[PDB]
Prior knowledge:
Chain A is built from 13 helices and 15 strands. The first copy, chain A, has helices at 48-62, 71-80, 91-109, 140-143, 147-158, 183-200, 216-226, 246-250, 266-274, 290-302, 315-326, 340-345, 371-376; strands at residues 4-12, 24-31, 36-41, 125-131, 164-167, 205-209, 233-235, 257-259, 279-280, 306-307, 334-335, 346-347, 352-353, 356-358, 368-369.
Amino acid sequence: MVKLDTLDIFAVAPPPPGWGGRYWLLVRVTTDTGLTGLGEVYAAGVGPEAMTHVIHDVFTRHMRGEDPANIELMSRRAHSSGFTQRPDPTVFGAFSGLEMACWDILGKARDCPVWAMLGGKMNDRIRAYTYLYPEPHHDTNAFWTSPEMAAESAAARVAEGYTAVKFDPAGPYTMRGGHMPALSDIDLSARFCAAIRDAVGTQADLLFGTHGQFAPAGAIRLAKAIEPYDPLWYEEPIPPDNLPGLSEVAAHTSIPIATGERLTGVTEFTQALHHGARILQPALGRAGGIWEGKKIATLAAAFGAQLAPHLYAGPVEWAANVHLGVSCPNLLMVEAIETPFHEALVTGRPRVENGFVAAPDAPGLGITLNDAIANAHRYTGNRLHLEM
Amino acid sequence: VKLDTLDIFAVAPPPPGWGGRYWLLVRVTTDTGLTGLGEVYAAGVGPEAMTHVIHDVFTRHMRGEDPANIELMSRRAHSSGFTQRPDPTVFGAFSGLEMACWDILGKARDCPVWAMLGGKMNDRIRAYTYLYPEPHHDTNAFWTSPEMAAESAAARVAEGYTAVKFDPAGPYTMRGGHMPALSDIDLSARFCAAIRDAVGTQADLLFGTHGQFAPAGAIRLAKAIEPYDPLWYEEPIPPDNLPGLSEVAAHTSIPIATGERLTGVTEFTQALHHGARILQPALGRAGGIWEGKKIATLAAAFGAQLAPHLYAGPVEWAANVHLGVSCPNLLMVEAIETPFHEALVTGRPRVENGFVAAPDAPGLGITLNDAIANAHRYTGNRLHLE
Amino acid sequence: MVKLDTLDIFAVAPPPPGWGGRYWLLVRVTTDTGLTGLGEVYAAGVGPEAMTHVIHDVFTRHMRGEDPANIELMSRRAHSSGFTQRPDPTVFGAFSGLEMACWDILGKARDCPVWAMLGGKMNDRIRAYTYLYPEPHHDTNAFWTSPEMAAESAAARVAEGYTAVKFDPAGPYTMRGGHMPALSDIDLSARFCAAIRDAVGTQADLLFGTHGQFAPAGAIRLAKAIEPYDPLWYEEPIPPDNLPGLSEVAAHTSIPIATGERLTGVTEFTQALHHGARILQPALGRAGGIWEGKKIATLAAAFGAQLAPHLYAGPVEWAANVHLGVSCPNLLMVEAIETPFHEALVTGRPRVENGFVAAPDAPGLGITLNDAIANAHRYTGNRLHLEMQDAPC
Amino acid sequence: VKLDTLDIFAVAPPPPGWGGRYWLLVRVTTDTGLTGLGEVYAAGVGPEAMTHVIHDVFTRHMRGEDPANIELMSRRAHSSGFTQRPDPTVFGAFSGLEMACWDILGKARDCPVWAMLGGKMNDRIRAYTYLYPEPHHDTNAFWTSPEMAAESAAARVAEGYTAVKFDPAGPYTMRGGHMPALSDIDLSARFCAAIRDAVGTQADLLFGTHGQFAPAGAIRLAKAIEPYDPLWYEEPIPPDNLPGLSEVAAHTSIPIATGERLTGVTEFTQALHHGARILQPALGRAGGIWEGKKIATLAAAFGAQLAPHLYAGPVEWAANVHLGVSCPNLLMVEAIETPFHEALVTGRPRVENGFVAAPDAPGLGITLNDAIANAHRYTGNRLHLE
């Protein structure tokens, strides 16, 4: 076969509005034979520059000169790097992106889409969802605190075939740790659910997604307010540093618990399952990669839990999301961001059509990087992809 | 490519029959022409009854499908008949057939199976064997002889084996768990002593009972063997009592191994939940190679290890080796290196100096010697194991 | 006494509309001394062609040449067959049919109805329910999604004396496993419960039957919509392969959890009892038979739980249910299907009269097969008795 | 006063490099002119990519802040980039920089660091060292020789040491928890046997291992060494498996120690609940001096003790000294008394008669010798440990 040879890293900035965050970290790996693979690093603990050297280290150290198929080998090496052998969202965030490429390469060599190597085409189409984004006519500023403007987004996404919609009306997440929700935060939450259920009725599930900004006692209060709207999940009730807190939260609400976007490694997804979380939302560019995600879905199944891959990034982590999803039985839905820039950055991006995504048919991840777009949008700045 | 035709082989191994009364091999041929082998490890009913079962599951859930669609065939197989609960008779039959799908997938991709299971994690893999009577050993007295067991063990060490299995604990019966007689305990201590003497630090001792005993009874047995530092205590109690594994694991410093009679990653979870730290799936019973890999995953999440079971032919063995190669937590693979095992197929992975090197050829890297298999056909009534 | 000698197996196709299944699998065992017993197998993993070779295997290998009163002996043999000694719905489902046939021969030898060998006549009459089938004036296709038609059909059953009715508006079940229930499935579940609740008032309990379609988290959302209607049970909320998932569902809902139609062996039921199910529903032709049924009933009592023998099969498993039901202090109700074919296929079938079945009077199971009916309806097709949809959702 | 500049020193210790391949020292300097020393203990990626991490953290969460605001800066680095969960890379970088904030605060206020951690609980603190090859000892055969280890121990004792650590169980591999060979078990027995004979009651045994083994294997090994009464069993299993610690603790009467490879108060909590009773934070990884204080408080909650890890330079050393002085539940402090440690800084706290007096001087009490540090600058490819 081939060995991994060279690596290129692209810091790419999406235009205003900027759904998917400040920058994206794309990797293109070339083999010794000449095949290229795309991958997506999802980490913000340090900034896009610092991360370039982290990624180069990881590749150079554990990956360059290795047969792509040796995923378990390369994952073990990365996880164990420097006498650690405990999870690391920065080091293992790097590896995930690079690993993604390896599957893209392996697909190309073996002339089959990545899912053809993950257990096959379980799901001919996979269920999709988006965040409720302003309508062309909506005033951007006021949209975020407006139930009525959200209800119009909900209806239009339903008119497009979306069968589930996400929204985060509980305001800002801080670095201080889990606080106690404002009564204005509870109110606007109940009003958002109330206007959206009023709008959509039976046609779309409600996806309530706070960002881990509340303490478990507070998260409980909010659950009781939004319950009578049958949200399909309560995403990230509490800070990720406190997976044991998930338990008291599950046992107090009827609403299913979703988590995992800030988690890294199958070993931590285990913890979240044990403590009662029933919808795992791994970010494949942070959680370890495609194969690690397959091991997350297996764990989720063992607990009767389901999968909902996370997306707040580019179209390269989306490509992996789709492929993993295609091959999982316990897949619930995939998060989607269908901006025009996602569609222009690469070619062959799988598309959400009528609230679902068809099983990709092209070898590998089926995506090709258009370089001119990539470098026209090249990123410069200290700042983080997603700040608190 | 699609699945098209199925042939089944009932093979009876010649005397002394190390590996069972009969082996149930399947060969699946695509519409293209690629073939693959698999072995079915289910003995609740005879090879005739099972022939019909295999054929039923194949036609009902598999024929017409892309061999790359394992998860979908596995869901179909598991849910068959509106069940969606572990059934070693339906799932066993499917496991064999799933192995074949990888063999085809290997051949199409010009790949060894381990290369589609996450890579070459382990360059060679660790092997062990049951302590079989030596050519000069009296066969009838051997089994209750610590002296002779020691002799076999010492030879295995000479052949480069790092671990040996033996069961001096006696008869397994349909009665369910029973108290060990003092003679079973006494003979089990003596055996250990004798094998520890002959091997020292060069071989590990694997203590394999066959689920003979009530938990409380298997505990007594475990205390008496601890001074010998067995590497595992296997199947200490009946496999229908996975909650009984908890009181055993808390009562003994010996790691608890189970699995060979479990089917579906779900049941292996129960075994882990209740304290087992070595999982011993038999791939032709447990749902096949891909399921095995998830048994390996859940095992990992528990700090548990994998010890693929072999009491069958060279196909399940080949499968076992491929799984082995791809898993970081793989402890060892169970080995039966009989000349018949070796003759029945060509390409078979071999134990050299107590290790098997990761395979080379595409697929399982084994092809069936058809004349041998037909000339060794099984006619009769009796079960593989009783 | 006598020894078991020969076995004849009957594959029976229920006529349209197929209340009972695509096919029933009946066994008739004859002794050396000339007595015959009827038994029914509940197994759908493999087809009835392959089942006949399984059932003939189990009988020949463990049961022929044996005093039929050696129940424990044969059950152990059949559980432990082929070096296994763990639950096997295929092998042991086969055993159950044959085991029922034994109890039938024992009842004929001893001149004694089967219940009188399981603790006698606890219940003089036994409470019965039914599915909600189309009233003659209902459109068949529309019926399944119709809360008004289900109310009318529910009213009709209360007027016949029934004091519980069962329905499943939760939508089709998939091989994919547990999935999240649709908002429309929950909607239809509540609308169904509301309309039936109005129709029957206080005069019948609501038996909410899902078929294991949903993931534990989903099941709880659904249980939340139907609670205001006070359903007597929430049956088979999650796939039967995840009994540790009953615990979280039972904890989040005030609705009693019923299960166990897809479970086999008293050990598996035990696990459902340890995880919060309080109503167990064995299908006797799968669980391990009438004697196993008794010991699933004893374990229920140990947990303050109740027994509700399942029935989606023929009049032999129905009889066997009725007799086990007579004998248990913790019996809640037998599931019934009261079709003509059921009453034609055998003579002696227990009849639900005014919402209740009375303890039968005849030796054995009190049911004889009628060969002509049996044969005229012999099964020939390829497909299964019960099947799970291959569709996405 | 506000934090301003950061200087970073990658220092390579000369042969035999007792304390690791290289040390990541940071020098912080305020607007007012004040300077503080810190030390990062992270290996996940090399010294080059760490220089860039360390710089990123300080410029984002630290520059322009009063050094007194430790809680604030810690929240920012912990939550950096919308994480809010442990990160050994980012937080390990924060850790070194936080140490510096305490040294600056030491100087700004004219008092030792421990004077701000609740004061002088311990006048001097119990110290211990690894068994290192004595000058006359053959360097290659030493690591596998109990007879030699015993001799090192005899000399540590004569110097006033009251504890000694060693790892005979051998090598740590990326493969994860594995079964110990019988020769690792036998060599761990013999080491313990030989060291107990040389030391008597005069010194406790600290049994190092590096998470080599799976819990069930780690249980076996403990059984072997129990008779010699070791004071702890360190890092029996991999640190990705804190739940595993639970079965180990219930199976051995040896107190379980862990922590060096953990980060964030939240992870030590997990380790405590699963039953470890000696927490060994590596301060340049864990979160810093103030984090270790909190790690020390929770240890107290579970009735546990604290024993600062050291496999780094004389800054992490100094930070451990000051934290140690101020904790009732301090058990010991790991000591690497090499000449170079003593050369790299001025006013380094020494181990004397096996104990370390509380420092007298403001801050951490250590000033850096730049030209020493510049001569021994690192310029290679490899990790601190592999």
